[PDB]
Amino acid sequence: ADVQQKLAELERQSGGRLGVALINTADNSQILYRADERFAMCXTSKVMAAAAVLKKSESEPNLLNQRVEIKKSDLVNYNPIAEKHVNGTMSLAELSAAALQYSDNVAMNKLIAHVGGPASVTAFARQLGDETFRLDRTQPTLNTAIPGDPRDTTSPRAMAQTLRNLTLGKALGDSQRAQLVTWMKGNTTGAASIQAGLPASWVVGDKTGSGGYGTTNDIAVIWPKDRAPLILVTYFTQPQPKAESRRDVLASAAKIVTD
Ligand SMILES: [Cl-]
Ligand code: NA
């Protein structure tokens, strides 16, 4: 009740729309706030794309070593890693790491294309038992985050459950699960988001997202000191098309639900 009041107060002060789902594996409990509403995933969808490639690799041993050409025509709006590799190749492992750890747009698009496109990523989610996730578009258009638009959305509840399956459950084989967790623990983009609301000693693997309407997102697997792990999804979006980022809102939500 108090956690619910605190999240409602945070949402009101922020001016936007906040979605939270925490799974605490200590006691199999959840803390939910707008957890069945849809939110634009933005960058957070790259976990599903990378997981689809990892799943494909379970029946294609050297898949992660497969080379992918990077060309000027592949560049999109945010290419921090791929821009360094234009006119050469990157492996699927390198693209997965760039997508997950730097939010590289080109890398996401190569993962999407490899597995057959947005509808194939969505079909993979369905195979896992996630009937909420939808990836409709590639980068950069999947980030538009227009209010009322269901494209490229999921709910906090569904994303938390799916992230739990991918990182702590059995969606992926042991090698592939460990690889996903290692990639997420090496993320470089999340220090101001969920991590900023947790004690410094806790270990986090996370994936952020951002987009139009000031959309600011983070999804995380969290190992608190000497405790069972948590899964936390914090999704946030705002009324104005050109609203600025609000990573502090995600940090505040994380602090509220883990205090
Ligand atoms: Cl505006
Ligand atoms: Na989206």
Author numbering: 28 to 286
What sentences appear in the manuscript?
CTX-M-15 (cefotaximase-Munich-15) is a class A extended-spectrum β-lactamase (ESBL) capable of hydrolyzing penicillins and cephalosporins, including third- and fourth-generation cephalosporins such as ceftazidime and cefepime, respectively. It is predominantly plasmid mediated, disseminated worldwide, and encountered in diverse Gram-negative pathogens, mostly Enterobacterales, but occasionally also in nonfermenters. CTX-M-15, like other class A SBLs, employs an acylation-deacylation mechanism to hydrolyze β-lactam antibiotics, utilizing four invariant residues: Ser70, Lys73, Ser130, and Glu166. In this study, ultrahigh-resolution X-ray crystal structures and mass spectrometry revealed the mechanism of PAS inhibition of CTX-M-15, an extended-spectrum β-lactamase (ESBL) globally disseminated among Enterobacterales.
To investigate the process of cross-link formation, we obtained structures from cocrystals of enmetazobactam and tazobactam with CTX-M-15E166Q, a conservative mutant in which Glu166 is replaced by an isosteric Gln, such that deacylation of the acylenzyme formed during β-lactam hydrolysis is impaired. Cocrystals were harvested 72 h (enmetazobactam) or 3 weeks (tazobactam) after setup (and within 24 h of their appearance, as with native enzyme) and diffracted to a resolution of 1.42 Å or 0.91 Å, respectively. Importantly, difference electron density maps from both the enmetazobactam and tazobactam cocrystals reveal the presence of a lysinoalanine cross-link between Ser70 and Lys73. Conversely, Gln166 is present in two conformations (occupancies, 0.57/0.43) in the CTX-M-15E166Q:tazobactam cocrystal but not in the cocrystal structure with enmetazobactam. Otherwise, the two active sites are similar, with both including dual conformations of Ser130 (occupancies, 0.62/0.38 and 0.60/0.40 for tazobactam and enmetazobactam cocrystal structures, respectively). Asn132 in the CTX-M-15E166Q:tazobactam cocrystal structure could be modeled in three conformations (occupancies, 0.49/0.27/0.24), possibly as a result of the dual conformation of Gln166 but also reflecting the extremely high resolution of this structure, allowing detection of all three conformations. Asn170 is in the same conformation in the CTX-M-15E166Q:enmetazobactam and CTX-M-15E166Q:tazobactam cocrystals as in uncomplexed wild-type CTX-M-15, with no evidence of the dual conformation observed in uncomplexed CTX-M-15E166Q. The Ser70 -Lys73 cross-link is therefore present in all four cocrystal structures presented here, with a newly formed d-alanine at position 70 in each case. Despite these minor differences, however, the structures clearly demonstrate that cross-link formation is independent of Glu166-mediated deacylation.
